[PDB]
């Protein structure tokens, strides 16, 4: 009765991240030059799939993102990179000694993809001031998920009803959105204030980001 102890019990990882699971064995698995250590992915409601047989040998049709490892008592399956399709319980198993035993399994949770917005402020062009109207633009670029509270603040004063906003259709690949808010004023209402700014909040950001420019 060889006890295989998987570590960790549960990990949450983002696609793009490298993840590693570990099987410790109560005794050595090394016999006749190989170690009889095998790893199984079980996706929910599906039978297990073998990935790695002999702590190294990748099974046919398993991506190279999955790798094998070592010998004695220390074994490690590595996912480099992790993909969304990788959400499953990973089981380690020995065939060194009867009875064939399985590790306790490791639950691999794919973390919800979070994309912080690239925030950019833009002052009105000279060519526009000459034409009599001022239009400041705040770009929230490639953010996920959709929910995002931004606000125009001119010389630390919350503006209202003087800005419209458009939003890009969610991107096919990375599911990211972009938002463009256009604060519009008169050349008068523009040469009146100094620091035109834009405070942005989103899960992705630690603290709200404020893009600002002077010489208003």
């Amino acid at each position: 009765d060889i006890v295989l102890t998987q570590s960790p019990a549960s990990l949450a990882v983002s696609p793009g991240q490298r993840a590693t699971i570990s099987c410790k064995a109560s005794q050595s698995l090394d016999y006749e030059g190989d170690s009889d250590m095998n790893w199984y992915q079980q996706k929910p409601g599906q039978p297990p799939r073998l990935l790695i047989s002999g702590a190294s040998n990748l099974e046919s049709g398993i991506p190279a993102r999955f790798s094998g490892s070592g010998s004695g008592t220390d074994f490690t399956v590595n996912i480099h990179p992790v993909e969304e399709e990788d959400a499953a319980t990973y089981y380690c198993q020995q065939s060194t000694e009867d009875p064939r035993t399985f590790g306790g399994g490791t639950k691999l949770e794919i973390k919800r993809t979070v994309a912080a917005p690239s925030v950019f402020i833009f002052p009105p062009s000279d060519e526009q001031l000459k034409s009599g109207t001022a239009s400041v633009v705040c770009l929230l670029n490639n953010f996920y998920p959709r929910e995002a509270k931004y606000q125009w603040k001119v010389d630390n004063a919350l503006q209202s009803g003087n800005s419209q906003e458009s939003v890009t259709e969610q991107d096919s690949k990375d599911s990211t959105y972009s938002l463009s808010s256009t604060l519009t004023l008169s050349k008068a209402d523009y040469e009146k204030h100094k620091v035109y700014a834009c405070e942005v909040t989103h899960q992705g950001l630690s603290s709200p980001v404020t893009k600002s420019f002077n010489r208003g």
Partner: protein
């Protein structure tokens, strides 16, 4: 190519014996061992044992010696596992899998046969008498498994009838209610008998519903 095929979900009574197939195809079959593995709901993988189809030689895990019996049919290219003295402890998905043998790796797995070992139970059928249009019904209670079908007055009565979806209770038994609205005048004449079919227990229960004295 390589396909292992097992039976669908089995309901079975405590103290009986299920024989689970495994139809091997797209490979030699007689050249590879077939391992068996037990998995309880949201728990992990337990090895039962393996049989070499050539000689029919079998290795068992200790915990399963005297519970499981691994068999085969070379002629029909099919493995078999017979579980006896069935208890709730044996409710689990059961998997056959092809053994790579060099590393003793289960290389191709069967879809798995989910085996549930509990007693099938017909419903108790209590009436829901009205006291004042009025509504009456019967409450089907403590049944296993789904489904139960409910007619009224031998299917003669069909309007006003709301046979509700089933509700699992802590007990692990189901319970629905069938109700029907009817003219409060016909209470004094028309007899109201709800009929309760439960093909699982070959049960058919009739219950007259009559206002409380």
């Amino acid at each position: 190519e390589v396909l292992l095929l097992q039976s669908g979900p089995e309901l079975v009574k405590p103290g009986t014996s299920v024989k689970i197939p495994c139809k091997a195809s797209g490979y030699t079959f007689t050249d590879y061992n077939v391992d068996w593995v037990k998995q309880r709901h949201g728990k992990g993988l337990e090895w039962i044992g393996d049989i070499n189809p050539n000689n029919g030689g079998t290795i068992y895990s200790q915990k399963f010696k005297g519970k499981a019996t691994l068999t085969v049919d070379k002629s029909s290219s099919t493995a078999f596992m017979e579980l006896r003295s069935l208890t709730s402890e044996d409710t689990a998905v059961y998997f056959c899998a092809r053994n790579y043998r060099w590393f003793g790796a289960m290389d191709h797995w069967g879809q798995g046969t989910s085996v549930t070992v509990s007693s099938t139970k017909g419903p108790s059928v209590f009436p829901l008498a009205p006291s004042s249009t009025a509504a009456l019904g019967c409450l089907v209670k403590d049944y296993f498994p789904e489904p139960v079908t409910v007619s009224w007055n031998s299917g003669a009565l069909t309007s006003g009838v709301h046979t509700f979806p089933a509700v699992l209770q802590s007990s692990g038994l189901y319970s629905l209610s069938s109700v029907v609205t009817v003219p409060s005048s016909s209470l004094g004449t028309q007899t109201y008998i709800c009929n309760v079919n439960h093909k699982p227990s070959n049960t058919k229960v009739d219950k007259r519903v009559e206002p409380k004295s």
